[PDB]
């Protein structure tokens, strides 16, 4: 086949990109009179760039860092490569599980080990980890992948303390998943609580913006950051200069800012038709982290197994994707599927969500 | 200060850039109608994209791969580290010297140990290769770094035969410095000939195109490309989708060639006139590698050292690169520096190295 509906957690809704301001970018920057940026600039990122981005994890997320602490590159994987470099072949990590994998993932390259945490209603598990000799704990405080849980102002302040308790502990605070919240309390960036320079800050323009570009930023405390550009003198950024130009500018001139304002209100929209339509199934079909991100986790009591239900989906032309991809847990019961609807076009959401339950043996509405 | 004359070997012309018809693809690219590039495309490198680069090595380099032993990252470096992870703790990498210090520089931060050998007329010392148990060959075998040297057929043979001789030995072919040569013999890949699944290519858009893009491809032997796709099945592209699909197009309807060929015209004249310039002080100027690449090296008769001549031209705003800096064994006497002229521009040469040999004390012509 080729798949027509995509549920991809990540994606974006592509249809509704300002194609027209970023071209318009494109044409001020790539052109005779900036002939210079076909050169490389600085390793680190634009000066202007990292400005830019100070400013915007400022106003967005209470972030307080200098320019100079803000190291741009090429995707998260490039940066967390740089950083398990850094701080060097002893440390060891503690991970979210479930969870994004890439982290696991990645150290089985490196010498570093690593431990898994259980995430609840709370956020990560700190008393775990207290408990457990690990150095640098990754954890996503703001909305935990796949739940959406929040990490509690209490573990926010005893995690602190576990790592203001030793000079080679830090924290990384993970917030690749841009910023889509429609409800709860609007709660800040635990890095804007550091004060001891303890907290290493990650995220990138993926979820606002495109996630193609491979634009991403890790801020470092400022100790790391005379450390990094001292180690990494040598290297080249791994962003294109005139996308950097681009984006810089994109972001002075207020555009990413309405660019963002306008995104939330559409997925704001598509997410409500979704729960509008899945709340009608609340017996056989339940919805975790209803209120966070593109996307929902459903449980499924179909006696259906996960497996079943992926295949069954994809013969509709839906894919769908199962929760144990995000568990190192073997056992997850009941079945649980991840539902992002970034991708999906808000005139086929009806259509789309319909060919998923009807492929699942649900009684579906006309129009599918 | 701001530097107005920068003798960088790596720089390329910008204000000969085609920037209408880059800007003319970013159009037809950059547009509702392809909205599904704005999401992630296959890790490796876009299919088209990675077509494009194995046609244009196979024209150009005489280079034998297919799509899929090609990865596409942003710079040597990124894919260097990637391959460096892929062959393993265990490998030992022999390095040219001279040379660009990148790929021990990145070895620092890996288990890897690596060892120099010398380059000469013919290229990396072979003989000493063989007697040193290294597993991984680095080389730039059509135009050294910053001599200019060609790895000599019977040494490419001899190396070949060094890495069939054992299961764990490989080689790496730095094609970095691939387009621009206007003497002696065009000679083709250690890639072409290489039948053994022994040798890993490496290159990038940059002295063709434009350095800042960050777009490199290195192209894998079948068996390692199939380990590569599994092993870094998790990963994403470090190169945008946008600039891949806009490459090629930009190389598919031939633009990439005019480019390279008008390009070529420029950088040779140039040459010419640097050349033209610097044979009148052959007394005290000795000029190496003169007619390959963007760059020269001088060496200098002044008793003034290499620091000294360094400083003395950044001084008057000229920033020129002492020989030093691309070497592990010992200092170099009579100093030696290396001026680029890429993005010195063509009608500014004169003034340009009046500049820099004014500051020597050197006699300029036109004052
Ligand atoms: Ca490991
Ligand atoms: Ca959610
Ligand atoms: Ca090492
Ligand atoms: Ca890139
Ligand atoms: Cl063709
Ligand atoms: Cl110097």
Redesign the interface.
């Given at each position: 086949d080729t798949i027509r509906y995509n549920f991809?957690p990540t994606?974006?809704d592509?249809?509704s990109?300002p194609?027209e301001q970023?071209?318009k970018y494109?044409?001020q920057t790539?052109?005779?009179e900036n002939?210079?940026?076909?050169?490389?600039?600085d390793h680190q990122g634009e000066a202007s760039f990292r400005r830019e981005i100070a400013y915007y994890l400022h106003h967005s997320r209470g972030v307080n860092c200098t320019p100079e602490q803000v190291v741009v590159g090429?995707?998260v994987?490039?940066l967390l490569?740089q950083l398990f470099?850094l701080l060097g072949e002893s440390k060891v990590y503690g991970i979210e599980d479930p969870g994004y994998?890439?982290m696991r993932?990645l150290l089985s390259?490196y010498?570093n080990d690593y431990v898994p945490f259980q995430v609840d209603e709370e956020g990560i598990d700190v008393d775990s980890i207290v408990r457990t000799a690990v150095d640098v704990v990754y954890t996503t405080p703001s909305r935990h992948f796949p739940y959406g849980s929040v990490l509690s102002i209490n573990r926010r302040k005893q995690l602190l303390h576990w790592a203001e308790a030793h000079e080679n502990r830090y924290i990384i605070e993970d917030d690749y998943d841009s910023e889509f919240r429609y409800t709860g309390k609007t709660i800040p960036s635990l890095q804007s609580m550091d004060v001891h320079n303890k907290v290493i800050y990650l995220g990138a323009f993926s979820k606002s913006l495109?996630?193609?570009?491979?634009i991403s930023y890790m801020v470092l405390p400022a100790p790391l950051a005379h450390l990094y550009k001292n180690?990494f003198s040598?290297?080249?950024?791994?962003?294109?200069?005139?996308?950097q130009q681009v984006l810089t500018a994109f972001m002075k001139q207020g555009d990413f800012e309405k660019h963002l304002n306008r995104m939330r209100k559409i997925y704001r929209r598509k997410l409500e038709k979704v729960l509008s339509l899945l709340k009608r199934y609340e017996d056989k079909l339940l919805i975790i982290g209803e209120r966070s991100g593109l996307h929902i986790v459903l449980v499924v009591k179909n006696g259906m197994d996960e497996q079943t239900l992926v295949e069954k989906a994809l013969a509709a032309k839906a894919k769908v994707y199962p929760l144990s991809a995000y568990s190192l847990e073997r056992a997850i019961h009941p079945p649980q599927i991840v539902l992002g609807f970034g991708?999906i076009p808000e005139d086929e959401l009806e259509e789309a969500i319909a060919t998923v339950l009807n492929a699942w043996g649900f009684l579906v509405p006309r129009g599918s």
């Open positions: 991809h994606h974006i592509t249809t990109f194609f970023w071209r494109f044409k790539m052109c005779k002939h210079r940026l076909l050169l490389n600039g090429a995707g994987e490039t490569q470099l994998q890439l993932k390259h010498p495109i996630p193609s570009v491979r180690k040598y290297y080249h950024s791994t962003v294109s200069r005139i996308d991708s």
